[PDB]
Each structure stands twice: as C-alpha cells, then as structure tokens.
C-alpha cells in the first residue's frame, strides 16, 4: 500500500480556538452563522479568524477611523447581509502540506450575485478564514481586500 511522508513537520503555532474543520465545511458554517445571527460583531467571531485578522479588526475599531467600513460589513463586498451562500467545493485535503487555499464564494441576494473571494489557511490543526478579496462589482468601501483596506 505504502504511504506518503509529509514534507513539513510543524505547520502550527495556533492561538485561538479552532472549529472542527473542512474548508468548504468551515466556510459554510461561518456563512450560516452570518445569515442566522445578524450581529457581525468581531468579539464572537474569534474562532473563525486565524490569528491576527481579529487583532487587526480590534486595532482598526480602536483607531476610530474606519467606522463606516466596520459598521455596514467588513466580510462582504455588499453593504447588506446575503440571502444565500454557496462556497466552492473542495474534495478534502490530503495530509497537512496545504495552505493558502482560495475559494470563490457565491453569495446571492434577492435576484443578485457578486461571487466574492476568500482565503483559507491552516494555522495549526484547523481551517481558518482570511483576506476576503471583495471580488465583485460595486465594492462597499475603501478598496482591495479587507486586509489591504485596514492595513497601514
């Protein structure tokens, strides 16, 4: 039968709590939380953000400059919460030598669609959300991705 030895041996240093796993599964769970719970607050979203998107959002909120971006929506190109979500399908991931997996998430409003883009990274032994590249027309505010929006 034989097996394949992983090339890497650490792929770790995780700080916050992690959800079960599954890239498409984790994206579905996060977006189901977004649709069901209409809060969008960053305090209760720590397990999904990887290790420093939460810190970046907290620092941006404390800076008192990007209030308009934070209030409407930081995690989507549209200023309103979606009506339905369907992320790209990945047929699991072999071993642990896989990071920076981009997924094109299709968010559908009332007869609307923009096909946003997000990233997912390992950061330990879980699957965590990152970037969100606002891949759609009529961008909410600032420009680029979320990270480039709040970067300095």
């Amino acid at each position: 039968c034989t097996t394949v030895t992983p090339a890497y041996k650490d792929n770790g240093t995780r700080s916050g709590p992690c959800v079960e796993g599954g890239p498409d599964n984790v994206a579905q769970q996060f977006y189901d939380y977004r649709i069901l719970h209409r809060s969008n607050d960053i305090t209760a979203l720590r397990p999904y953000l990887s290790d420093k998107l939460a810190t970046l959002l907290s620092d941006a909120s404390r800076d008192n400059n990007h209030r308009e971006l934070l209030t409407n929506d930081p995690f989507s190109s549209r200023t309103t919460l979606p009506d339905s979500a369907h992320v790209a399908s990945a047929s699991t991931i072999p071993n642990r030598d896989a990071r920076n997996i981009p997924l094109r998430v299709d968010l559908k409003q009332g007869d609307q669609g923009w096909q946003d883009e997000v990233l997912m990274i390992q950061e330990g032994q879980c699957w965590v959300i990152d970037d969100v590249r606002y891949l759609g027309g009529s961008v909410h505010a600032t420009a680029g991705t979320l990270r480039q929006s709040i970067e300095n």
């Binding site: 399908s89 047929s91 072999p94 896989a98 981009p102 961008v139």
Partner: protein, 432 residues
C-alpha cells in the same frame, strides 16, 4: 504616421498574435472532437476467410464471407461530459491568453515608437557635439600652427575628434536599428513619424493606489487565468473520481454471412451437418459494465488530482501576490517619472540661461565661437534628456493600464493627442 495609424497597421500584419489566434481557434474547435464520442457511431466491416481443417477434422475446408454494419451508442457515461467541461475551460484559458497577447502587442508597438523618437533626438545631439569638437580641434590646430601649445594638445584634440566620430557612427547605427525594429513589429518601413508637442503634453496625477488594486484584483488577466486553471483542476478531480461509476451502452447490427463447406469428409453421408448457409442476423442489444476493485487505480488517481488541486491553489495565491507587487511598483514608477520630469525641465531652463549668457558675452566680445558652441551642445543634451524622460513617463502611463488589465486602443488614442508635429527618420535627412 501617428501612433494610431501605426497600431492600426500592426494589428493586421503582426506574425506573433496570429499564432495565438490560430491556437485559440484550434482549442475552440477541439470541443467538437471531445464531444464526438458521445454522438452515435456506425461502422462497416467485410471479411472473407478460408479455413483448412486437419487431424481429426481432416478433409474439411470452409469458406465464409461476412459483411456487418454495426451502430453503437453510449447512454450513461459521465466521462464524456467531464471531458467536455475540461475542453470548455481550456478554451476559456486560451482566450484569456489571447487577450493578454493583444495587450502586450499594444505595449510593444508603443515602446518601439518611443524608442525611434529617442534615437532621433540622440542622433541630433551627437551631431551637435561633433560640430563643437571639430571646432575645438581647429582652434587647437591653429594655436599650434602659429605656436602656442605643444604637439600633445593637438594629439589629444585629434583623439577626442575621432572618439566623437565613432560615437556619431554608433548613434546612426542605433537609429537604423530602431527604425528597422519598428518595421519588423509592423511589417512596413516608416519614413516619417509624429514627434511630441511640448505644450500639449501635460503631466497628470495618478489615481489612488487603493482604487488601482480594487480594479486590478478583478480585471487583471493573470488572476483570471489562474482562477480558471483552479477550476480546471477541480474538474480534473471530479473526472478522476468518476472512475467509481458504471457504464451503459446500446448496440445494433446487421450481418450477412455466406458459408460453404468442401473437402473429402464433407463429400459423404453428412447430409444435414454440411450444407451451404446463407445467414442474416439483425442483432440488437444493450451492454452494462460495473468495474470493482482494481488495486489502487481510482484511489491513487484521485489522490494525485487532489495534490494537483493544491498546487493550483498555491499558483493562484502566488499570482495574486505578484499582481499586488506589480501594481505597487507601477504606481511608484509613475510618481518617480513625474519627479524626474520636473527635474529635467529645471535642468533645461538652466542650460538655456547659460547658453544665452554665452551668446551675449560673445556678442559683446568677451567670448569665442567655441564657447557658444559648447553651450549649444549642453543645451541639446538637456533637451534630449527631457524628451527621453517624457517618453518614459508616457510608457509608464501605458504600463500601469496594462498591469490593471484594461489596455486597449482608446488609451493609444488618448496618447495620440500629444503627437502632432511630424519629422523624418532618415539618417541622412536628420544628419547628413
């Protein structure tokens, strides 16, 4: 000819984009070849065979002539649909590559045009320098003739004159190479090109880098190609996993056979077991196949497809990072070009003031002709540097648009509003 006319001529006859167009057409046409196996198939086959028996079947010979017309057609096989989807995605990525080739052709022709203009300016400056150095040599020779300097000064002046002659020859060859490069990229030799207008040309501030990134992350062609390649990798995973499904098909046939038997054994009391047969069968039926365990086979192929998908995701991330870096570099280049333009304009002003001072001094009577000639040489050098900087700024303004992924002929038209006055490009006409 202005930039617009040159690009219009180049778009037709340019033996680099035609290869891309032909490859795109071949990729598009391959869809029909991929779909053909799903369509019904029919075939014909005739075979005449003579068999000669021996041992127990001694004295037995047979002659069988058969003609069969067979029509086959599959019913449920997802592999064909998977291949069709793969071929469609391949056509898409090929079209994206063709668009990238169009953009790079626009950039190349603009660069060649500006290179030709720069070569013309350099040749003019070199000719002015040659005249000034020749006058210096004549001054030194006259001084030695009446007797004021040693022979070493004369030799040094002659060396400088030979050096400037070699420089002039090199500049002329550079101009010829630039002109013939324009001919190669356009397929036709251009004897005269539109120059730049000083007043019409204006330096404009670029849009904020954030908006550049916002438009580039959705309009850049490399990112779209990488995303489509990732989609192709996903479809490859699906078609590799398709190995777990059974297949179903239907067949029909019409076969006509004529068989005859002879030989010593046949020539006897067989009666009914040895007769000439004229048979015809219309065979119709189905066929269903469900493979089971074959060793690794499907599982290993699926694992390899998963690894390929992971690699495709890595490629997409790398492409995004490179795109961001390129956009930032282009924006910084535009700003640096603006600053250099201002600096060279100030340098040109200073050189003009110095030349006017030298001319006034010569008119009064405190200067010689060679001093004003040197001032003219310096002014021409400053003018050439300023023109080259302007061309570099325009090329950067095209490069930012190319990086953003929206370059087309409208940008060339917008640039063409500054190219107004014409000028010949013949080396003899510019400098005999």
């Amino acid at each position: 000819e202005n930039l617009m006319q040159v690009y219009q001529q180049a778009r037709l006859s340019n033996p680099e984009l035609r290869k891309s167009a032909a490859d795109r057409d071949a990729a598009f046409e391959k869809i029909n070849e991929a779909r053909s196996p799903l369509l019904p198939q029919l075939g014909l086959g005739a075979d005449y065979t003579y068999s000669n028996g021996y041992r127990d079947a001694n004295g037995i010979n047979s002659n069988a002539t058969s003609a069969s017309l067979q029509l086959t057609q599959s019913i449920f096989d997802m592999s064909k649909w998977r291949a069709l989807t793969l071929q469609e995605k391949a056509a898409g990525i090929q079209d994206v590559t063709y668009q990238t080739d169009q953009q790079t052709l626009i950039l190349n022709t603009a660069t060649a045009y500006f290179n030709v203009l720069n070569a013309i300016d350099v040749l003019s400056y070199t000719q002015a320098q040659k005249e000034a150095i020749y006058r210096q040599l004549d001054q030194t020779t006259q001084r030695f003739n009446v007797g004021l300097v040693a022979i070493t000064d004369v030799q040094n002046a002659r060396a400088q004159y030979d050096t400037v002659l070699a420089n002039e020859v090199t500049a002329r060859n550079n101009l010829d190479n630039a002109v013939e490069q324009l001919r190669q990229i356009t397929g036709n030799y251009y004897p005269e090109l539109a120059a730049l207008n000083v007043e019409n040309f204006k330096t404009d501030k670029p849009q904020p880098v954030n908006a550049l990134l916002k438009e580039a992350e959705k309009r850049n062609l490399s990112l779209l190609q990488a995303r489509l390649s990732q989609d192709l990798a996903r479809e490859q995973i699906r078609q590799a996993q398709d190995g777990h499904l059974p297949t179903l098909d239907l067949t029909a046939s019409t076969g006509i056979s004529d068989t005859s038997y002879s030989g010593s054994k046949t020539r006897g009391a067989a009666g009914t077991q040895y007769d000439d047969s004229n048979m015809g069968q219309n065979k119709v039926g189905l066929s269903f196949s469900l493979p089971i365990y074959q060793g690794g086979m499907v599982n290993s192929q699926v694992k390899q497809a998963q690894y390929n998908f992971v690699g495709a995701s890595e490629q997409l991330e790398s492409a995004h990072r490179s795109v961001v870096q390129t956009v930032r570099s282009s924006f910084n280049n535009i700003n640096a070009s603006i600053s250099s333009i201002n600096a060279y304009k100030q340098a040109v002003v200073s050189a003009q003031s110095s030349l006017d001072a030298m001319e006034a001094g010569y008119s009064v009577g405190t200067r010689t002709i060679v001093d004003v000639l040197d001032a003219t040489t310096t002014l021409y050098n400053a003018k050439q540097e300023l023109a080259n900087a302007r061309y570099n700024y325009l090329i950067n303004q095209l490069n930012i648009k190319s990086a953003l992924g929206t370059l087309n002929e409208q940008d060339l038209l917008a640039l063409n509003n500054a190219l107004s006055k014409p000028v010949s490009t013949n080396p003899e006409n510019v400098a005999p």
